[PDB]
Every structure is written in C-alpha cells, then in structure tokens.
Amino acid sequence: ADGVGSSSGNWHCDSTWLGDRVITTSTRTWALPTYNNHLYKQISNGTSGGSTNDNTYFGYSTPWGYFDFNRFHCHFSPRDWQRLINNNWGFRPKRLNFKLFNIQ
Amino acid sequence: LMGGFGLKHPPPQILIKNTPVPADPPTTFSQAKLASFITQYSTGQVSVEIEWELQKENSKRWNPEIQYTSNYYKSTNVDFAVNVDGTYSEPRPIGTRYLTRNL
C-alpha cells in the first residue's frame, strides 16, 4: 500500500485525561537539510586565538540530524499544563510512541 | 431568581419539637389546659449527606483559563479560617463561573 499518492499517516495532536493518567499526543511538520555536504568533520577549539582553557573541546560533527522532544511544551498545551499543575501532587511519564510519516 | 435549582418536590421540611412535660397538676380536677411545664431544651448532632453529579470540562481552548485563587501575599489572617478570637469568617463571595465555553 506504500505509494506516492497515498498518505502514510494522519495528524494526531490532542490530550485525553483518563482517571489517574493523561495521554498527550502532538504532531509537527519538520524540514531536514543536508548537513556538512554528507561529510563527517572533526571540530575542536584550542587555547590559541584568545580562547580560554575552560572552553577547549574536541569532537566531530555528523551529516545526521536528530529528533528531540525534551521540553514539556512539546507535549502539553498551556491549558493542559494548568489542569496538571492545579489538580495533581505529582506525575511521571509511563510510555512513549513515536512516528515519522508523509515524507517528501 | 435568587439562584440554585427549582424543584417541584424539593427536599422535605424537617420539623422538630421538644415534647412538653407538665409540672405537677393541682390534685383536684380542672378542665383548663395545663399551662405549667418543666423548662427544657434539647441538643444533639445532625448529619446531612448529598451526592452531587459533575459535568466535566471538555474544552479544547489553548490558553490557560481563569481560576479561583488564594492571594499569595502575606496577611494577618488566613482567608476562610478562624481569627485570634476564634470566630470563622468568609471574606468574599465565591461564585461558580470561571471556566469558559463557546456559545
């Protein structure tokens, strides 16, 4: 069924409040550039050039990108965040589900 | 018009009275009703329990809604609490209308 003219996913964004748990789903549109012209490159900073010893580093930059949802406002709206903080003593994440679809 | 729920058959009236206990009658018969009673009062505990049904808020509004809040700033007394002399007070009227809906 995978094809050019049929969508591979739907837009699911909302929250649902059931008893002792809440399920917050959110959908976004992204754009991915080519990084580093498909190259790995080492990156470093030394003391030469007026930089401090404290800021020295050595590493690599990769052509890859990455998905990160580590901020709460990704998952919660301001109204949902208000329901959470006003009514509850505590919360913790139970489980996660991730999807990529409708790729151009 | 003052507020609340109109009811054709509302909660019934609950009527209570101390049964009269007469003092000693005359020892010779008299038809007049007895006007002399023992002074009495009664005390006790009353308990009432109501079950309320709730209508949950389904709103899809994005921005945070207005809530009823206690003032954060310091004060001599706590709102809705007893004072130094021990009397309880309600500092303000609290209505029920805070969350919002669309027409």
Q: Which two tokens stand for residue A33?
A: 């550039």
Q: Does A79 touch chain B (CB under 8 A)?
A: yes
3-state secondary structure chain B: CCCCCCCCCCCCCCCCCCCCCECCCCCCCCCCCCCCECCCCCCCCCCCCCCCCCCCCCCCCCCCCCCCCCCCCCCCCCCCCECCCCCECCCCCCCCCCCCCCC
CB atoms B64 and A82 under 8 Å: yes
Please indicate whether, in this complex, the C-beta atoms of A86 and B63 are within 8 angstroms of each other: no
Question: 3-state DSSP helix/strand/coil percent for chain B, to nearest 5?
Answer: 0, 5, 95
Tokens of B61: 């509004």
Count of other CB atoms within 10 angstroms of residue B15 = 5
Contact A61, A40 (CB under 8 A): yes
Q: Determine the residue type at A39.
A: L
Resolution in A: 2.7
Q: CB A79 to CB B67 under 8 A? A: no
Euclidean distance between CA atoms A89 and A12, whole angstroms: 28
Chain B CA closest to residue A83: B64
To the nearest whole Å, the CA of B97 is away from the closest chain A CA by: 17
Q: Which helix (H) or strand (E) holds A87?
A: helix A78-87
Q: Which of B71, B72, B89 is nearest to B80 (CA)?
A: B89
Using the Cβ of A87 and the Cβ atoms of chain B, whether some distance falls under 8 Å is answered with no
CA B24 – CA B38 distance, rounded (Å): 9
